Amino acid sequence: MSDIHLEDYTEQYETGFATVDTMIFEGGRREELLNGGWHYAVDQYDTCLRQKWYKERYRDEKGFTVPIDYSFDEWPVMQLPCSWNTIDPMYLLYEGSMVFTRKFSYIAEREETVFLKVGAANYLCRVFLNGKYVGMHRGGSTPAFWNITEYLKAENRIVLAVDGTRRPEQVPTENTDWFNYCGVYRDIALIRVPKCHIKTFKIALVPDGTFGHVMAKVTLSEKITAKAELVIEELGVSRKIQLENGAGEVVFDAKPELWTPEKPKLYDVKVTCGTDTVSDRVGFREIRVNGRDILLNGEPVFLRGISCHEDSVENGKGLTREERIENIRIAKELGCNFMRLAHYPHNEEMAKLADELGLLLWEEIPVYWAIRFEREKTYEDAQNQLRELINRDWNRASVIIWSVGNENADTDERLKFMSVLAECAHREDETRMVSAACLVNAAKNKIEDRLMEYLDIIGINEYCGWYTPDFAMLPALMENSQPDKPVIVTEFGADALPHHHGTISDKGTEECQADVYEKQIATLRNIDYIKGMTPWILYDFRCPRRTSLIQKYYNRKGLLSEDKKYRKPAFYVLQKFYEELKRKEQEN
Amino acid sequence: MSDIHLEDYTEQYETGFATVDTMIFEGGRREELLNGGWHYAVDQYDTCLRQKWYKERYRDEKGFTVPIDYSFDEWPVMQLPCSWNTIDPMYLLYEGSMVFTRKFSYIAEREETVFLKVGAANYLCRVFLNGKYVGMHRGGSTPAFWNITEYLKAENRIVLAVDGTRRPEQVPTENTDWFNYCGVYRDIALIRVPKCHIKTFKIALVPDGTFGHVMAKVTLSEKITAKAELVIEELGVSRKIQLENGAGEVVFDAKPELWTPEKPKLYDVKVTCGTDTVSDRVGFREIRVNGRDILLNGEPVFLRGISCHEDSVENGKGLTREERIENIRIAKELGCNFMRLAHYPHNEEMAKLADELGLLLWEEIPVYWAIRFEREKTYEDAQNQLRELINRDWNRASVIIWSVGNENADTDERLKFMSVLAECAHREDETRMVSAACLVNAAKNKIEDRLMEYLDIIGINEYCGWYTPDFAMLPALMENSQPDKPVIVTEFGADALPHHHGTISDKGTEECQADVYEKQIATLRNIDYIKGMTPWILYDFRCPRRTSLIQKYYNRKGLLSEDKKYRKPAFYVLQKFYEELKRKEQEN
Amino acid sequence: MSDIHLEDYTEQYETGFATVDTMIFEGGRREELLNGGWHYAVDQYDTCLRQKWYKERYRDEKGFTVPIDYSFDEWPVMQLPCSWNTIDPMYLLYEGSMVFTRKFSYIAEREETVFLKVGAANYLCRVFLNGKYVGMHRGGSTPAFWNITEYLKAENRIVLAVDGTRRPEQVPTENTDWFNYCGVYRDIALIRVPKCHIKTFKIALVPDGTFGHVMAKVTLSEKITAKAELVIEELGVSRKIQLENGAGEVVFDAKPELWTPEKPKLYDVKVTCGTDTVSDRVGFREIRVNGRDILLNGEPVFLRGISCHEDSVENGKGLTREERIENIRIAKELGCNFMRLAHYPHNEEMAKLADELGLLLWEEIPVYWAIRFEREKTYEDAQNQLRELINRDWNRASVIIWSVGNENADTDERLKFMSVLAECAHREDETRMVSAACLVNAAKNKIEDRLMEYLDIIGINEYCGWYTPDFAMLPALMENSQPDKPVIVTEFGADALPHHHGTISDKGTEECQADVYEKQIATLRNIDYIKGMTPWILYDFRCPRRTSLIQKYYNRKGLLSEDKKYRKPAFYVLQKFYEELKRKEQENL
């Protein structure tokens, strides 16, 4: 009677964790996927975890059949990966648990280690394989790896129990300004590698101002001593890396062409060690800060930016390749060299496509609003997602800034928490800038926040002409503040329901939105220390907090409609400002 | 920025509680309802409680409009009362918050106090009137009363935020075996009373075996000294009751015809005090236990019962009057003199119709499975629900047993918790028997549970031939057990998907279910200390735990299908058993 | 008890008219739209106008609530502008009244005058602001302007009552051959202007044969003395225009590139006066008639045309910008240099896109079939719509012809009515040719109609091989006729349901339609006084008069289906003929 009398039915599954220490480098690796039709159940009360359906007990010891509350093969079927919310109206608001299962066959051709990768599952994913528990992942927007070598048979049944439940102690908490898309919504892969394989491969230009040195780090799955060979044919590079007890580094002379969004040059890179081979396609660029300047490849830049959520009318958070491309293309049509990917890790393809098509990127973890900053396990969660993000995208030239959070109050525990996050980001990546979206000091109307001393670039959200309705507060704010570092205005904007019009003073109309951009641009363009802006937001996205007739459960601050087929007037305001910058920059 | 940075946003609303102490007696009272169309929003993130939409702050202090996330009058409309889950497939699985608002006008023709009654709302209901917080109710199945006299204007706006969220510390916990129907699903009333009004009125046959004494108790809204007058014309009773500091009692002589299911005799009763008048319609009957016998009006009885949930395909938990009547009518066609209403207070009209049509009842509170028995506030919630139930139904001759819970593990903290609940029920109602569905000691296959010492009647759930598949365990259970008090078999049964057939060994088919009933009846009918049975259950009901192809998210142990249009074979098995008992009863 | 016993409940609203005299020039002006979701009701018995819902009388003089028959904020919501017929199938055949309402805020940064513009509302639009009647507009295809300055508050509620009703005395009458799309179906705008603002601005090449003189006329809202400065940077122009009593004009020398459909050259022009600025984008060209010749910039032209309705499966009469562009693109694919926009003013964007992409235009008012020609108030309404159209489109180089009507009986009252409209057009616009679609004289089978004496170009509708089944009637008609002016065959054609085939003698099929085009072209191409043709019609349109199985409530004379995805065989017959003319023109260079 444990299934109904055990209070803490989850503690037994707090093991087998996928974490940053469990990830393996995927570049160049052949993968079989488990994408497809999985049989499923809505498991509102987490009954599978309690009764242990994955054990498939159909008879007792005395041989009698016993009643059961599942029928795996006769369950309906759902195409994975997906955000289950968009798969049927019945699930749009469902955020409990769902249980998915399917079979697959396994034949080893050589001795090999096998990893299961779950590209993303929000928020908890628990894995069962052939009746046994593998482990779980915490965090909704990051890939999870598990070593399943010892669990495989010739014929296999895998069960995934995925819980969409919101909790105040999670990252994010139960209160955000975006939609709670749940389920397994990025690729599910099987990854065969040699028992000793390349586990991490990091490569980057050394940020020493000379553009002449390239660094590369490699670690193995095994604490053995061996040499690995790194090859970049286009650059005439062929250098052996001495690994001692699984780890090794090399700094070598090379002069690649420096990546920019205008010229997104990328090189093919191959690494071998024993019978293993990984590869990558990488750019080389230097991002640095000097006083108030943001230096890309030595030259001061202005970040002509837009914010973007990972949202889709038909697909929820599981955007397609084409939707990512569309997002990049529209931002460049907008005149953007820069995009703020909020508020969580997007699909890793986004930064790869940004490498190829040319767009600078800001990537962020959902340390959002009222995170339980004093809770040690909440920090372990945030810290792990931060490092998952950084190890996943370490080789992405497009990505220049990591963000450790957004719009958090200026309290002691917040400061202890996020300042150590900032320090963690720096230790994991000597090459990139560290930022966060900070709030304006309301009482003073001033850029003032204890966390800014710990960031390379200050991110500021302000909504003058909207949440702070008096426009005179914008010039006052900028003159009350004289920062030492560069400031990116990471958010401003206003609601505009597509095709809803009015006077400039009717908040929520297109005209008011265009007006807010006019006045926002008129001030921000002449502020010395403002080096970028990513207005909120590229296109309307699902939002549970917006229940008014002129919102309809979408955040209406997009410059385009939610299907991105319609540009609002404010879109053309910003585009004209960015074309002015683009041409003044070419008249130089 | 409280609405986004306040962590414990609900603590401010832990006040103004509707509890048993705030209920008022409704019998005979004229009521204006707030049933009808209410404008509503889906409030997944509880934004209304954080942003305080009920304040209607549309401009700031210097006269600028501010952005808002709601539009009360332009919201869509939902007819209350209802379980919101049955209103639209989009809400079937929604168990977050919804916000409801509407307007009403108020004109007092005379000095009066005004109560708001929410007939039930699962699970939390918070009340706002004209921008002010009135208070809240905890507990999903009991009526909530608040005094809104000091809040009323000539024109009024009332807002109800209702949270269906399941929580381990609630009563029930987050794991039950029935569907989580949410929202305001019983009548919303406005009740006008004299400032000094009759607040409780209790009347009952004195259970002293003489059937010649009637007790009656009255309390007032004010701790004054006055005389009330009780009138029962048909019995020539007209007694004055002396009240001191708001309370008074009387025992008096009367020889009413004693209520039975077979002759459900009911008398009209009226009480007056000052300018107040209340009235009831009650029966007189004695329910007592003597050794192993259950005594109704001095005679031992066997309770031919069925269990029943408050479920409806169309209406969720908000059953109609006709659905209630149907339930009683079908139970009597089954040959029932008794009905277990599981596992929570049903609509108070159930016991009123049972009063009228003649059916003995068991009523229960959802102290179910793994209640947080160690948590003092969980006890406070459970005890209040219990006393809400007892005060609401005190005058219902049909109801003979209160149950303080169901299938809880025999632990120390459960024993402290539930034995104090049984004591509480005895202190609040000296007239009725107190019970609970206990479990069978599985180690010994014996009726053995420390709680049973504190119960007047022992309730037992056993599923021999089903969850315990070997039928031989049932005769063994009954021989291993020699209880000193009456035992009711409060549950047995088996699944049968309607029109799903197989062999008697095919668990989940109609044939196997009929077999289970045959073998259950052949043993139980000859056990001396078994004085009733309420097989589980009358009809199929929604159930989030049953995901198999032959369940389809319904518990399939109904004797009829979920729309009650089809009787399974086991229906006719139990029926012929009960008809045998009715016949042998008459031959005596 | 007036709401129910009052017989003539509309008389009280016959005031505050938006007319031609009430329009303001819009070029270059910044506008705040009132487009978007309006709360609405179907008001089948005109209850809002009788009960005066816009007064929002909720209590009586002693504080009692009184029963009301509306609830503005709790009404459903419709997205305006649109033809309400295509918004929901329940409104397809509805042509009564609907009442629309919304709120909006107003803060003046300056002392200013404000106009409400309703871009188009068919057929009557009654306007209320903050509980007061503003005025109305009569005529379903022209923009209406009211000065609402004195009505505005900080918070405003506006109500529009829009009647779809067809009436025999209206323009058009209750009987036409197109669909009665109803509602507010073009932009609703708020327009802020200085107290003294530029009210009209007309500019055109002087049609004197030299191509070197430009005329520009300006009027103001106020009858005052002042000067306006006109600038055309690209032509190095900067003349002051002296204004007296709010009006003045100027003629000056310039040598612009002359607009043609093949080289549609446009110039930016700006006009300032006081604190006001308007601007426009105009081409310069000459259209005149010399005998039987139509002369564009001095050269004879043949008008390779098609006719076109304002129709859309999805949007009704509320066409989008991209549907307009499509119509132009498909016309040009067909080989057209010309388009007859029938039978009413289309969206003003149509002539603007034609300015830009290069397409000559015929624009027309719905003085159509059995107009009540004897009724003076019907003349007022028609005269108003003609002048509205001319004032709205005066500066569109693409538009070379105004049409005062189509297929009207050759009676005396018709003659008085339509000749006076022709004189009106000429008086209001010295630059453009005036025409109309006249019927064939059935007695003589001859182009003969007393209106033609008043027209610059004769329009002829004929349907030989269709309504006149015997093709021989067509060569007979041309032989019988020797007009002194140029003739455009402004309609011919034949039904063909898309994908419905048969023999050439099966009327209603694709094959019969193609065969009709072969025979019309074979005769019309050799009649030397025929200087153009706008076959009927580019694509199928909704039509309440066509109920057969092979019509399905659509007029099937389109050369393409109603969604414009499918070209019928006859489309290629016309295309081949126009491409022959085009190649012949190139080899004549």
Ligand SMILES: O=C(O)[C@H]1O[C@@H](Sc2ccccc2)[C@H](O)[C@@H](O)[C@@H]1O
């Ligand atoms: O309301 C919004 O549109 C956005 O609010 C900001 S937080 C903020 C609110 C007021 C002032 C400054 C910052 C969030 O970062 C964003 O995710 C959300 O969508």
Ligand SMILES: O=C(O)[C@H]1O[C@@H](Sc2ccccc2)[C@H](O)[C@@H](O)[C@@H]1O
């Ligand atoms: O499974 C069921 O059908 C029922 O299970 C019982 S608990 C129990 C389980 C095994 C043995 C004894 C008792 C619940 O009281 C009831 O609400 C539910 O519907």
Ligand SMILES: O=C(O)[C@H]1O[C@@H](Sc2ccccc2)[C@H](O)[C@@H](O)[C@@H]1O
């Ligand atoms: O019937 C038609 O297809 C068209 O008829 C012509 S009138 C006419 C009829 C016979 C001979 C000459 C002219 C209309 O102008 C047009 O709107 C309509 O669609």
